């Protein structure tokens, strides 16, 4: 079981960490949503599906930089809404195909009342999301750590 | 990670056991050495070397039959000498190629002062060597057990 991003960055068997740079909506009004859809960037496969099924959760997530300071929001995992930052583990997603299939994570963030000007500086760390893989065969309990970086400024006009 | 012998006998992923039949000096004097070079019999590979590192040790080695009764000895593991029978686990050998590569083990056995006559009966178990595989990714601790059989009698002249 391993995970790849669109831009080529990979975390191999056994887990690890990676830096993912995501393009953001250059401007977001107070009361609009900013969406960070990792389901179109992170894809995971099962390396021996004939005997084993892999179990994937969003174990925990934290906000940093402008997302921490200037945004409230939730995370959507496989169709359900969860608090963000998430302090508790999500239900499991099954992987039993060699075919790259998405990690169904998307952040829904709204600027806060007092937000104004550059609310996310380009190149800054905006979140850390921990993917936890287990299986039905082994004692394997791996963490794939995704450090989420902003590719561009995000402006909240006032 | 799996291991094969020269005559084709194999121990699959997860570990197991095999019989290795070794040719010995038909006659060996007290103070001469009898050498069992396993590096020409046992071969192991790493089944995913690109991301993974396999670690191999001699967990224990034990003497049986005539070798126990009538021989002193040492084992040489990857350039270093250790007593045989073994009093500790050995440092690690790295396996990082899908190509079958030897297990760098050699037994040096010398008949003891009181040794005389037939010291090893052909077909008898003379040693058991436990190869322990680990890795750099999970908690896998697998045992590849090698039962060492004499292909011929050995006589210690008096
Ligand atoms: C004789 C017999 O039957 N013995 C039994 C044995 O077969 C059986 O287990 C399986 O043996 C198969 C024999 O080939 C193995 O298939 C290959 O797996 C490779 C990946 O191996 C690593 O991953 C597995 C699974 O664990 C990871 O993945 C799962 C799945 O998501 C996940 O749950 C885990 O958490 C983890 O992320 C591990 O078991 C392996 O561990 C062993 O080996 C490592 C490395 O030495 C040790 O460190 C470790 O301790 C173990 O000893 C590995 O970590 C795949 O890379 C490989 O893919 C090739 O072949 C398939 C076959 O179709 C292709 O589809 C695929 O594209 C790929 O082909 C490419 O590469 C080939 C050569 O590399 C080449 O020939 C091709 O042309 C092409 O280029 C394949 O899927 C299988 O993994 C073994 N399973 C297990 C669980 O170990 C065991 C199991 O009970 O019993 C024996 O008795
Ligand atoms: Ni793979
Ligand atoms: Ni193999």
From Swiss-Prot, chains A, B:
<dbReference type="GO" id="GO:0007155">
    <property type="term" value="P:cell adhesion"/>
</dbReference>
<dbReference type="GO" id="GO:0031589">
    <property type="term" value="P:cell-substrate adhesion"/>
</dbReference>
<comment type="similarity">
    <text>Belongs to the fimbrial protein family.</text>
</comment>
<dbReference type="GO" id="GO:0033644">
    <property type="term" value="C:host cell membrane"/>
</dbReference>
<protein>
    <recommendedName>
        <fullName>Type 1 fimbrin D-mannose specific adhesin</fullName>
    </recommendedName>
</protein>
<dbReference type="GO" id="GO:0009419">
    <property type="term" value="C:pilus tip"/>
</dbReference>
<comment type="function">
    <text>Involved in regulation of length and mediation of adhesion of type 1 fimbriae (but not necessary for the production of fimbriae). Adhesin responsible for the binding to D-mannose. It is laterally positioned at intervals in the structure of the type 1 fimbriae. In order to integrate FimH in the fimbriae FimF and FimG are needed.</text>
</comment>
<dbReference type="GO" id="GO:0007638">
    <property type="term" value="P:mechanosensory behavior"/>
</dbReference>
<dbReference type="GO" id="GO:0043709">
    <property type="term" value="P:cell adhesion involved in single-species biofilm formation"/>
</dbReference>
<keyword id="KW-0732">Signal</keyword>
<keyword id="KW-0281">Fimbrium</keyword>
<dbReference type="GO" id="GO:0009289">
    <property type="term" value="C:pilus"/>
</dbReference>
<dbReference type="GO" id="GO:0005537">
    <property type="term" value="F:D-mannose binding"/>
</dbReference>
């Amino acid at each position: 079981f391993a995970c790849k991003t669109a831009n080529g960055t990979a975390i191999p068997i056994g887990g690890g960490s990676a830096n993912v740079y995501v393009n953001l909506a250059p401007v977001v009004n107070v009361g609009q949503n900013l969406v960070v859809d990792l389901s179109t960037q992170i894809f995971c496969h099962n390396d021996y599906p004939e005997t084993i099924t892999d179990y994937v959760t969003l174990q925990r997530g934290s906000a940093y930089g402008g997302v921490l300071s200037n945004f409230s929001g939730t995370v959507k995992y496989s169709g359900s809404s969860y608090p963000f930052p998430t302090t508790s583990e999500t239900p499991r997603v099954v992987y039993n195909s060699r075919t790259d299939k998405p990690w169904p994570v998307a952040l829904y963030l709204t600027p806060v009342s007092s937000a104004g000007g550059v609310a996310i500086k380009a190149g800054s760390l905006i979140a850390v999301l921990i993917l936890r893989q287990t299986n039905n065969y082994n004692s394997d309990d791996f963490q794939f750590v995704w450090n989420i970086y902003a590719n561009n400024d995000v402006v909240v006009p006032t």
